[PDB]
Amino acid sequence: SNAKELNDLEKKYNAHIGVYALNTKSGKEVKFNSDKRFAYASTSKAINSAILLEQVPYNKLNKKVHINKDDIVAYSPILEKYVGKDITLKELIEASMTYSDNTANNKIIKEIGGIKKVKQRLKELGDKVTNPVRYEIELNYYSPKSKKDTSTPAAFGKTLNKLIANGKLSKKNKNFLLDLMFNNKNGDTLIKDGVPKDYKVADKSGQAITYASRNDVAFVYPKGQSEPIVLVIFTNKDNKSDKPNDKLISETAKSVMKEF
């Protein structure tokens, strides 16, 4: 059974696994520690991007945003080149999703209206679990004794479905975002490495600083099926300093996909 496989994986990798998968066509679900809290780290870049794309039409993503020296936070491989320059909303979302640029995500949250506006949107979506508190990079300071910047697999996956796969995005904005997730430069070792050949994966990965917190969320499209399987995989380990093994997420994805 899938539960036995995931239990063996927890032991093989000495790690904790949280899984929620929903086949949006059939309604079938796979759940494993799906109500346990994990740090979501950069997987939240998918949420913040979608919220911004709900309120800015595609042809208005040319709006310019000025980048100052002090805006740059750690792991901003794109935005560190824009100090003293302007960047468009389109280029912020591209940097955030394609390269996991942290400054880009911060500017996107600001454009949305800040952390409080994100929380208001989550409540409207019926997500009373996902708990944004800090910006990059402090949101990656995960502690098991704290709920800051955590979610559960089930809550995060239901929110991904409601915002993107079955949300209210325009045709152009939805195709723009999903293509970024199909084509991103950070996900090849995770869900994409684990799914069988005839699936197409649009993912966003995450890694927090502590407790080997390693995540991937995705919309997984079976060949010939336009409705995705929403897949959320959160993992961590017991010690603060441990380093993640991406193969855990790949093998988890391979196991979960046997259910669909």
Side-chain angles (χ1 to χ4, degrees), residues 1-10 12-260:
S1 70
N2 170 254
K4 176 48 176 293
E5 287 182 316
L6 299 186
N7 279 304
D8 293 340
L9 283 172
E10 287 197 317
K12 167 182 183 174
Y13 288 96
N14 188 35
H16 304 276
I17 296 163
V19 167
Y20 177 74
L22 169 67
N23 180 330
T24 61
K25 178 173 181 186
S26 67
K28 189 181 182 177
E29 304 176 295
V30 175
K31 290 172 183 175
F32 184 89
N33 291 318
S34 74
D35 293 313
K36 170 185 180 74
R37 270 178 187 282
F38 301 73
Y40 46 64
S42 278
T43 63
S44 58
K45 287 170 168 61
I47 299 302
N48 297 330
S49 287
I51 291 171
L52 179 57
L53 292 167
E54 297 188 295
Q55 57 194 59
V56 181
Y58 183 78
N59 63 339
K60 297 178 190 174
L61 299 164
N62 61 340
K63 181 188 173 177
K64 277 167 154 41
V65 176
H66 185 80
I67 304 298
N68 297 293
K69 202 274 308 173
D70 315 284
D71 288 320
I72 306 311
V73 303
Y75 201 74
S76 306
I78 305 302
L79 266 289
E80 74 198 359
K81 313 303 176 52
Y82 281 83
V83 176
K85 307 180 189 305
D86 288 330
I87 186 175
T88 61
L89 292 184
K90 183 166 187 290
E91 291 166 331
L92 286 165
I93 301 164
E94 283 165 342
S96 176
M97 305 296 297
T98 300
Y99 296 101
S100 217
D101 189 293
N102 281 328
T103 298
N105 186 52
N106 285 347
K107 287 294 191 183
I108 286 164
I109 296 169
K110 299 288 180 57
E111 273 304 290
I112 293 180
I115 291 286
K116 193 272 167 196
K117 283 299 169 191
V118 169
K119 291 179 77 276
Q120 175 195 292
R121 191 66 183 105
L122 296 168
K123 304 311 168 291
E124 292 167 350
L125 297 169
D127 186 341
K128 299 163 58 58
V129 172
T130 306
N131 182 39
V133 176
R134 295 165 301 186
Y135 284 79
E136 305 285 344
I137 50 89
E138 292 77 31
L139 63 83
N140 300 287
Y141 297 150
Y142 169 66
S143 164
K145 294 309 201 66
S146 170
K147 313 214 277 196
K148 295 183 183 169
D149 315 292
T150 62
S151 189
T152 63
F156 209 84
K158 292 162 189 185
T159 289
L160 287 168
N161 195 28
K162 290 173 150 286
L163 267 171
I164 299 173
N166 285 281
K168 330 303 309 201
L169 294 174
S170 68
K171 182 182 288 189
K172 282 189 295 179
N173 276 348
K174 190 182 165 49
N175 279 329
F176 166 70
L177 181 59
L178 284 171
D179 277 351
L180 291 174
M181 294 177 72
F182 282 128
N183 300 332
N184 77 87
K185 297 302 200 184
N186 301 122
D188 280 6
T189 62
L190 301 168
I191 287 170
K192 275 170 175 151
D193 184 74
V195 299
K197 271 188 76 56
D198 288 334
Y199 292 87
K200 199 194 201 318
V201 174
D203 85 292
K204 175 75 198 91
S205 56
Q207 181 164 322
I209 290 169
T210 52
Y211 296 93
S213 297
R214 188 51 156 153
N215 310 319
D216 201 22
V217 303
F219 301 105
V220 182
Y221 294 84
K223 177 203 269 186
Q225 172 174 323
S226 62
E227 300 93 347
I229 296 154
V230 181
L231 176 54
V232 173
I233 300 173
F234 293 162
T235 77
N236 60 29
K237 299 174 75 177
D238 285 324
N239 284 334
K240 186 185 165 186
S241 42
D242 303 321
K243 200 275 149 188
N245 186 333
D246 288 359
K247 264 293 173 176
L248 171 63
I249 288 84
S250 180
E251 295 200 72
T252 298
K254 178 185 196 300
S255 184
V256 172
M257 289 306 298
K258 290 188 174 62
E259 297 299 294
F260 302 108

